């Protein structure tokens, strides 16, 4: 219903209507964003601008140099990470090996961290100013663009909210039905949290794989939440600025990142800040949280 009755946000049909005819193939965003899409097999990096569901290709370079194939696990495996990240601002690393400037991705992200991954320093940068050769072993997992393309890259990403989407081989795209059901699940989860409905709340977490820190056990989490939720205090929780993105992976899972602003009120405790769920869609089409900020 276009009147948006109470509970609409928990309804897949509402989100399908809201997405409408938007191109959500690289995500469904509440902000204008840019998406740096790299495919490690094709050696193509593109930047797409997303404005209210209109996609425009603003940058493309073929024959890029990425790091090694396979998803990054540790510092020094030289792999370029697969997944969904963000891009920081142009900076000067102070080393001409990286070309004229560089841009830092956010590897390791929370999901990486709770999975016990290590490493860092996954940047997009250029080629050594001495003209020496690069190859997939020399970038240490970074992505190298031609130095004569970097000014245009810098211009396209400047002053924007910029995400990093790195595929291994398969072309990964979001689907309208998946985004809509994930958003329905997101607000169903919010309702369980609001109502301190512990069993429903916990059912949105992957009992097998969800972790808040390396090697956490799920009962440590469930037991803590059962205790906390037994207080049944009145809660008011608001989600906003929702940016939901397909999450390439090599686990044969359908994964998404759901980033949103969280605004939480109780009488004695309030917080607000940037939140993130890293989730899979399980075999039944249900959201299963793998990592939560």
Numbering used by the authors: 33 to 325
Task: Show the paper's wording.
The K307A variant (Pgp2K307A), a conserved residue within the pocket of the NTF2 domain, was also weakly associated, supporting a role for this binding pocket for appreciable PG interaction. To investigate if the loss of PG binding by the Pgp2K307A was due to conformational change, the crystal structure of this variant was solved at 1.85 Å resolution. The Pgp2K307A crystal structure contains two Pgp2K307A molecules in one asymmetric unit that superimposed with an RMSD of 0.7 Å over 281 Cα atoms. The fold of the Pgp2K307A is similar to that of wild-type Pgp2 (RMSD of 1.5 Å over 277 aligned Cα atoms). The largest deviation is located at residues 296–306 of strands β9–β10, which form a protruding lower lip of the NTF2 domain binding pocket. We conclude that β9–β10 is conformationally flexible and may allow variation in ligand specificity. In addition, we used two Pgp2 crystal structures (WT and Pgp2K307A) as initial docking conformers. The catalytic triad mutants (C174S, H157A) and three mutants within the NTF2 pocket (Y233A, K257A, and K307A) resulted in bacteria with cell curvature distributions that were similar to the Δpgp2 strain. Lower levels of products were observed in the NTF2 domain mutant strains (K257A, K307A, and E324Q) relative to the strain expressing wild-type Pgp2. Pgp2 but not the K307A mutant was pulled down by C. jejuni Δpgp2 PG sacculi, supporting a role for the pocket in PG binding.
